[PDB]
Amino acid sequence: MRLEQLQAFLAIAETGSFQKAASKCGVTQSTISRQIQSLEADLGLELFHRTNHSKLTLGGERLLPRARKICLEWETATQELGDLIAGKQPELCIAAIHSLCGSYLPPVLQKFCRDYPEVQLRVTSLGSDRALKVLKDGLVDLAIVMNNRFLTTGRDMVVEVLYDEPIELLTAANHPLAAYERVPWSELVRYPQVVFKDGYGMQRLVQEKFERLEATLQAALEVNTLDAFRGVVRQGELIALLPSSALVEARLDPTLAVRPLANSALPENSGLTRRVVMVTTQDRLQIPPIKHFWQLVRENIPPI
Amino acid sequence: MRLEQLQAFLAIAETGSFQKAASKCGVTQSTISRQIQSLEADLGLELFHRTNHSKLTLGGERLLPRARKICLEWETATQELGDLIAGKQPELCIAAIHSLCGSYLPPVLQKFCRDYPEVQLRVTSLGSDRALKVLKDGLVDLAIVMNNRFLTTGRDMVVEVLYDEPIELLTAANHPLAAYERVPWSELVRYPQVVFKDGYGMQRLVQEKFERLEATLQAALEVNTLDAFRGVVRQGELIALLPSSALVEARLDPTLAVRPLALTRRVVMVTTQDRLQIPPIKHFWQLVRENIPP
Amino acid sequence: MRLEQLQAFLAIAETGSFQKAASKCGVTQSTISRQIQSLEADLGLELFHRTNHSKLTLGGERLLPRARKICLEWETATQELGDLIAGKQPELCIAAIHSLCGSYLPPVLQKFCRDYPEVQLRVTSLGSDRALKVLKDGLVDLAIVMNNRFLTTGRDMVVEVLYDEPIELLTAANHPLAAYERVPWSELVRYPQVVFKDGYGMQRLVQEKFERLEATLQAALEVNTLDAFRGVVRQGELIALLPSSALVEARLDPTLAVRPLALTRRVVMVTTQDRLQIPPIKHFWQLVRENIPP
Amino acid sequence: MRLEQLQAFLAIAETGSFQKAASKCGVTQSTISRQIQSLEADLGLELFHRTNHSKLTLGGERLLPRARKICLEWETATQELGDLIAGKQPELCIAAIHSLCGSYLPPVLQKFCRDYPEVQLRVTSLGSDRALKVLKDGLVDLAIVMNNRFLTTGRDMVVEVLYDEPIELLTAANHPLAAYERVPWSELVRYPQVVFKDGYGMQRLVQEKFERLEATLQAALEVNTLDAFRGVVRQGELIALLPSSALVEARLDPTLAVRPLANSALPENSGLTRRVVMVTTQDRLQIPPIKHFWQLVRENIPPI
Amino acid sequence: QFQIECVESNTEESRNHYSKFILEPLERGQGTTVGNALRRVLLSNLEGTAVTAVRIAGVSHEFATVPGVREDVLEIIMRMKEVILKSYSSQAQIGRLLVNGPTTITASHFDLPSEVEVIDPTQYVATIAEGGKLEMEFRIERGKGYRTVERGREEATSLDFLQIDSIFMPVRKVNYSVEEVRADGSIPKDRLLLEVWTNGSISPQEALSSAAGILVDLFNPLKDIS
Amino acid sequence: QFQIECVESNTEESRNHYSKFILEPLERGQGTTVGNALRRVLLSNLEGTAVTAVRIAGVSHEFATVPGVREDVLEIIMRMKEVILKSYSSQAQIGRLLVNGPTTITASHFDLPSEVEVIDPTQYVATIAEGGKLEMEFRIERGKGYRTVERGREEATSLDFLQIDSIFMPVRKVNYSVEEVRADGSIPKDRLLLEVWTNGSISPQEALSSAAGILVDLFNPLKDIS
Known part of the structure; x- marks a missing residue:
């Protein structure tokens, strides 16, 4: 035969x-x-x-x-072995989190465009406990969650946090934290600071980040939907979690022109800011695409 | 120790x-x-x-x-410890994302984000297939996701049927559609008509019709991210396609703009009868055609 | 390639x-x-x-x-290849007594077996445990057991015991157990004994045949392979048994000298046709009955 | 708490x-x-x-x-937690290949097994793929095994010293096996070949014995009871044996012409040297059969 | 296999889904047991919804007229029982009604929370003359108790106080029967030919089928562990 | 919870596990729909091991003596019915018996295939004098055929030929009642009882309580999909 x-x-x-x-x-x-x-x-x-x-x-x-x-x-x-990439030509799935999906790296999109313009891309969720689960396996094809987890994969995981912006919060079209321009984290509970997901590592870090400035993370009522993060703050007021790197973008649109600020972050102990963390296996980063770009994207991340 | x-x-x-x-x-x-x-x-x-x-x-x-x-x-x-501390957990995941809660459902927003830790609602990124599973099975239970192509019931609640989205859209200062007035497709398409989380049921069904005739989404990223998909709009090669639905913005601020599309979108709550005895989520169902929409 | x-x-x-x-x-x-x-x-x-x-x-x-x-x-x-290659299938699994696999029954049996049902032959032995299971199992298709009763019909099978004797005793060098030929109930062993399966029923049996009048026990070495068996032929240090229809073949086996005790097992099971169901397989039934039943 | x-x-x-x-x-x-x-x-x-x-x-x-x-x-x-009681104090074993009841059995079965007689350890001819498997899933516990094909069985645990010996063969003048020549490539292997059990440490070792001891391997049937031997090993259908130390007790049969065969395959050589195979480190050590007999396996299993 | 054959099925307009149904094989007439059981079971621990109450405001009292009636509270409360209706609401509701002017009452013409529907409107309900007729408000409940009216909403005068003990199991007529068929060799074989009807709210497909459960569970929610 | 309370449970001459059993809260007579339900169904049918045939051949015939008897076949076949027994054998078997010499018959004294037993031996069975008494062999079956004495083991002659629809019915007196009760707060709920007895083969647990699940299934294998 x-x-x-x-x-x-x-x-x-x-x-x-x-x-x-x-x-x-x-x-x-x-x-x-x-x-x-x-x-x-x-x-x-x-x-x-x-x-x-x-x-x-x-x-x-x-x-x-x-x-x-x-x-x-x-x-x-x-x-x-395929035409683009040997296995799964389209393999560039980004993390779904409420911190930095949107605005901190447009020159990385530039280089990705420079090396390969308008190239179709994809996405996954991780968690951060679940990010851990699916990154020590390397599910999240590109992955960023508090480096303090997801450690296994190939090449001993290679823990790698590109940077750790320091957390602030959403002030608003009327915030009095948009009066009170800083953000310790009492200044949060001062207005209705709903915390994010208990269980999701994202908040495990924020638990610090709201829990050491005259406040303890109050995961009362979070709808777990950005749309709602705005569907009661489009009334003008309501306030919860948007971290530093996109807290270039807290002051935005004509309902809202907002008070920016830096981290109050008494929460630190050792090193403690939430960390953009590209972590990998050579197999995964054994090609121009991710390896060099994934490096460049973890590199060309300006305040812009 | x-x-x-x-x-x-x-x-x-x-x-x-x-x-x-x-x-x-x-x-x-x-x-x-x-x-x-x-x-x-x-x-x-x-x-x-x-x-x-x-x-x-x-x-x-x-x-x-x-x-x-x-x-x-x-x-x-x-x-x-704590679990036996007045741990009132009245939580019923329902569906409210993409269109409609893009715009006019800030009402249910008012009763699920302005409200206190109660009627806990886990509506996340989910569509009408990912909803048909999660939502139609009712983890999320009923919806505002384009009818899972089969529905209807009325009772524990205030009844109601469906609502709908006109043939138009939001963009940016000149975000491709904002550039090409042709409502016939192939206008914002160059911004590869990015698949806000691809193929939802309100996302697809209008995307289905949008590009079911020569017209094509030919999108770049296929992810579930209002912010990001609409955030990268800042970088500006991607857009949203929910028709004349989530445009309260280009309707608001015209560095996000409205020159139409044309193209079909409708929405009948999954009205899961699980919330035709119960109103967190019958509210979500009765709300809707009565409260979420207005 | x-x-x-x-x-x-x-x-x-x-x-x-x-x-x-x-x-x-x-x-x-x-x-x-x-x-x-x-x-x-x-x-x-x-x-x-x-x-x-x-x-x-x-x-x-x-x-x-x-x-x-x-x-x-x-x-x-x-x-x-073989699927069409005159692939006659006499191959099977014969649940026979631990010593019904030498020159005691196999001779007569291979002969009657020449008379129609000559399996693609074997060596085989169980322990009167799991063997009844295999007699139900169908993978073996005829077995032996010492305690659980049962039987059925006739011909190729029904009620039949496989030999009977105060359970007997392989004994060899490093073994003054030859003198343990046969005391009342159990004065043979009377020291750390155990038997087949740290678990089987010949095992429980003889452990409790030594104990069936209390030649006493400890679990440290039972009858497993022919060598684990000869370990009990070898020991005198920790010991077991081997029956009468099991002697014709064992006592002719290299060193062993077989030795009961007025220790005592029978064998009873569903040693009926329940796995034979074939006039050929019934031909063993001739030769399971013309061989061991007392 | x-x-x-x-x-x-x-x-x-x-x-x-x-x-x-x-x-x-x-x-x-x-x-x-x-x-x-x-x-x-x-x-x-x-x-x-x-x-x-x-x-x-x-x-x-x-x-x-x-x-x-x-x-x-x-x-x-x-x-x-270190002396006496040890997550099971006593607990060694040996899942043999069954050669050693020639004269070694009693000495290993004494010295300790007659001093702390509690561990229920055998001398039993383990299966082969069922040996490897139980050497992992579980069986007696430890190995006096001859590695002569299953080389690199994970290993990296800890030895004891186990056994070393041919698998020497029963032939007979009361078989025409008298003409059979010193159990070799042509007169240790020829006849409606029969081995021990398929799926067998001593019959991957006696099917080896048909392979390692190059016997046709007709396996018209499978015999470990050795009773098939004499059955047609003087009367003429098969060829197979007890191991050399197992021949010390097998040769005790009559009209069976001694012939040192399984460390003896092809030129009556290239057979079973019982290459010591052993894996079990400290494990549940420190207690009687594990601090006395676990080590004793080394010198006791093969004491002669 | 011991088995229903759905048989002649004629819901007609609805009320009495005339529904001769059959369960062919009943070795011995034991089929009757289920028959005579469900005979009560089919309309035993049901949950029919119906009235209790009435808000003839203006006529607090319950025998005085309320004019323009050609038929007074005595016949107004009389014309409740007959109403016909259903909810899941599992909890009370109201309808009111202010026709006026000379008018029957299109039973239909009504006031309508949750499902509360004229399971069949058009009941004559209420005459009247050109004079202002007056409101009629009232509870609605599911229940299974049509025996006691006393201490009703007499527990707390929500309004009008007047409350009647509604009667409510849709099926009012029904006709269970058995017949020893042949196949008597192995064992006298029998079959159960039986009707129900019902008001035309709930056909046996949602009534006989229920009860069926209703005990099957509840008649034997255990092997009488005892 | 709608629930059995095992209640008074006897422990002696098993025959009649006198077993007054209760269920306490059954909203109303829905639990009475059980008593009968059982009633019948219980004594509908436990399929039943029972001696059915007889091999004497002391006389082939069935009225002649067989001496030494102080009692012939018409009282020997009669002393069958009363026997009492059980198997799983699900298939026929035999016992024979050759006492002789002047003797009662220790009912016990018997002839005993697979699982077949004097569920209670010692029944008087059979007188006799010193003369050779003769064999008595016979079927055994477990079924619902406790009726119809004709044909059967007749179309198939077998010598020493008689057979008869035995009782195959262990569970005799049985009964119950009922009563309204307190707990009226949660409706005038109410209670039943019962007894059963039984022959002392198959206690209510494996008879009454067994019948419980005999129908629960079979009462409605389908969900009355009709």
């Missing part, structure tokens, strides 16, 4: 002198006719014209079902 | 994972990977193989047995 | 083992490991991932599908 | 003050205040009796759950 006898004797089955198998398939009169003489018995049906002249008796046109289908699999492989 | 250094010790005793996983607790990269030795003193089952990064030694089977049972025993003691 | 290495490639696409699954064969230090990369080029979809040792990259889902279907496709073509 | 504060008060709850905590838990004197106060409010019940003298208010009576269930776990390690 193997390739040479497969592909050889079959496309033979519509021509011979085995000179036909030598062509197209490759097996010469040598390893084809000799092996096929004994193979003429192994599936159990006469394929060509037993040393006669022209025939289609019981070749492989009816053997390829249990035969070719297989080597058609590696026929797709026979083509090539 | 240890369960913390035991949390990561697990990983250490698990897939070998000492330093890796040790740092994963709130301490140094190689701190728990040192406590293992502290426990090797007294322990007779702890393993610190210097020639078997993965290959185990049986410290697990003997002196883990507690280690998990303790683990959930301290956990669930601290879990019970 | 790879229908063999692919068998070891499935282990790397299941538990990610390219050196642990190749340790049974032996090649360099990992071989396949340095071969995964070689194939990484020969395979459009090959996860590489010596990195994901305990996890994965998707080389499986795409370029395994054949890989198993081929696998059983070449395999079951290899099965073909 | 810590074992200290735990029972310090859990039982002081019947003493009813301080100091006794030290006489109950670790404490030397009465260092339980910083604990009781930290425990008073932390589990959420009145510990002791603030100026309420002797009176059982149940801090521990209902605290033992987890708390003292937990430290009862390490409660069995506070009495012994």
